[PDB]
Design an enzyme around this catalytic site. Structure first.
Site, PDB file in Angstrom:
ATOM      1  N   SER A  42       0.807  -1.224   0.000  1.00  0.00           N
ATOM      2  CA  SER A  42       0.000   0.000   0.000  1.00  0.00           C
ATOM      3  C   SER A  42       0.844   1.279   0.000  1.00  0.00           C
ATOM      4  O   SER A  42       0.303   2.366  -0.113  1.00  0.00           O
ATOM      5  CB  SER A  42      -0.987   0.015   1.178  1.00  0.00           C
ATOM      6  OG  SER A  42      -0.323   0.105   2.430  1.00  0.00           O
ATOM      7  N   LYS A  45       0.381   4.022  -2.464  1.00  0.00           N
ATOM      8  CA  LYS A  45      -0.511   5.159  -2.188  1.00  0.00           C
ATOM      9  C   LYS A  45       0.179   6.491  -1.965  1.00  0.00           C
ATOM     10  O   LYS A  45      -0.401   7.538  -2.243  1.00  0.00           O
ATOM     11  CB  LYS A  45      -1.463   4.843  -1.035  1.00  0.00           C
ATOM     12  CG  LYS A  45      -2.427   3.760  -1.454  1.00  0.00           C
ATOM     13  CD  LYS A  45      -3.359   3.315  -0.309  1.00  0.00           C
ATOM     14  CE  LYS A  45      -4.043   1.999  -0.678  1.00  0.00           C
ATOM     15  NZ  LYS A  45      -5.205   1.712   0.212  1.00  0.00           N
ATOM     16  N   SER A 102      -7.727  -0.280   4.288  1.00  0.00           N
ATOM     17  CA  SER A 102      -8.223  -0.468   2.920  1.00  0.00           C
ATOM     18  C   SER A 102      -8.352   0.879   2.222  1.00  0.00           C
ATOM     19  O   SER A 102      -7.345   1.522   1.948  1.00  0.00           O
ATOM     20  CB  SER A 102      -9.543  -1.237   2.912  1.00  0.00           C
ATOM     21  OG  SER A 102      -9.323  -2.552   3.415  1.00  0.00           O
ATOM     22  N   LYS A 205       3.192   6.557   5.895  1.00  0.00           N
ATOM     23  CA  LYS A 205       2.340   5.480   5.399  1.00  0.00           C
ATOM     24  C   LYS A 205       2.878   4.153   5.907  1.00  0.00           C
ATOM     25  O   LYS A 205       4.064   3.851   5.760  1.00  0.00           O
ATOM     26  CB  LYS A 205       2.349   5.481   3.850  1.00  0.00           C
ATOM     27  CG  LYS A 205       1.371   4.486   3.209  1.00  0.00           C
ATOM     28  CD  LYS A 205      -0.077   4.835   3.516  1.00  0.00           C
ATOM     29  CE  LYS A 205      -1.040   3.920   2.773  1.00  0.00           C
ATOM     30  NZ  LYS A 205      -1.328   2.694   3.574  1.00  0.00           N
TER      31      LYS A 205
END
Length: 347
Positions: A42, A45, A102, A205
């Site tokens: 992820s 992102k 998510s 993150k």
């Protein structure tokens, strides 16, 4: 002698790769396998968010504008967390989806909103990868889910972190919000280090998948100094935040960042021949930041040399005419172009 010129030993990091850099100077204080290509999960992102931030900085849309959830975001029920097609959600909520476990639908909705399709947005992501000079990063999707092939590196993720903070600061302030509204529901930020009262962590993150392991890009400050760590392929749950905390803490203990010269400030004055005035004011056209071993500021030496015997008009503003040399212990650790701060036309 020795405790002063000492080179600090690096803590053991229970992860596949890592890097610790200073936000301002760019100095790498520690690294292990920093250029090895790995699945960032992820972390992808961060780039999605970089593009969106650029779009907002360019004034294309704002946090209050309403976005339409396409069959698009949905295609990737029993749950309230999911954006349903046809609903309208403000950008403000969607972009904060980055702070979730998510929120992959939100990435899709934002990508369509900013660039028309997921694939064109990815095209912008890869364009920025290139603009930032990243050698070991390539994206396939805007959320990193279904991209067995997506890759980046500890170094490149650190650099993306640096870019967010530098280039799109309004997008970056989003990362430290501990709680926010997403789809009508109160949600907690996944970055647990935001709650650590020992460090002042404000980004960036964290992510985990069975295949990519634990992954985290973090950033912290101590007064005027900012550090960015990236730890990829972290092996255990227990170390998911602790390994990076240790690394950041170590950085602050053994290193300090100095700002010896800002642009526009006269580092030196120099005689000029044949000009409409007889003195040139010299400095830099880019702020100077150096990272040195903590406690050595006083030993930092700065001097300069001129690229020619002496100065002749005409001189242009920001014309490079020499070199600024910084040293520690007789050694030159950093060099910078010496520039003319104001034009001196021929007499």
């Amino acid at each position: 002698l020795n405790i002063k010129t000492m080179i600090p030993g690096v803590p053991q990091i229970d992860a596949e790769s890592y890097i610790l850099i200073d936000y301002n100077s760019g100095k790498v204080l520690a690294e292990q396998n920093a250029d090895v290509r790995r699945d960032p999960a992820s972390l992808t992102k961060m780039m999605t968010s970089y593009v969106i931030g650029q779009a907002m900085k360019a004034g294309k849309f704002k946090e209050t504008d309403l976005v339409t959830i396409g069959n698009d975001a949905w295609a990737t029920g029993s749950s309230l967390m999911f954006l349903k097609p046809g609903m309208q959600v403000p950008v403000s909520q969607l972009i904060r989806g980055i702070n979730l476990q998510s929120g992959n639908d939100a990435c899709v909705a934002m990508a369509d909103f900013a660039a028309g399709s997921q694939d064109a947005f990815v095209g912008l992501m890869n364009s920025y990868v290139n603009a930032l000079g990243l050698k070991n990063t390539h994206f396939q999707t805007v959320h990193g889910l279904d991209a067995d092939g997506q890759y980046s590196s500890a170094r490149d993720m650190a650099l993306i972190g640096q870019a967010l903070i530098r280039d799109v600061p309004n997008e970056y302030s989003i990362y430290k919000e501990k709680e926010f509204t997403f789809n009508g529901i109160r949600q907690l930020n996944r970055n647990g280090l935001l709650w650590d009262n020992s460090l002042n962590v404000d980004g960036i993150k964290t992510g985990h998948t069975d295949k990519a392991g634990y992954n985290l890009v973090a950033s912290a400050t101590e007064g005027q100094m900012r550090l960015i760590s990236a730890v990829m392929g972290g092996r255990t749950f227990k170390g998911r935040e602790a390994e990076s905390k240790k690394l950041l803490t170590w950085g602050f203990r053994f290193f300090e960042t100095v700002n010896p010269l800002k642009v526009g400030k006269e580092f030196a004055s120099e005689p000029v021949w044949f000009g409409d005035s007889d003195r040139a004011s010299l400095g830099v056209d880019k702020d100077v930041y150096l990272t040195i071993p903590r406690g050595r500021m006083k030993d930092l030496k700065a001097s300069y040399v001129l690229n020619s015997s002496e100065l002749h008009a005409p001189l242009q503003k920001n014309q490079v005419v020499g070199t600024i040399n910084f040293q520690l212990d007789g050694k030159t650790i950093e060099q910078r172009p010496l520039v003319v701060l104001q034009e001196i036309p021929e007499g």
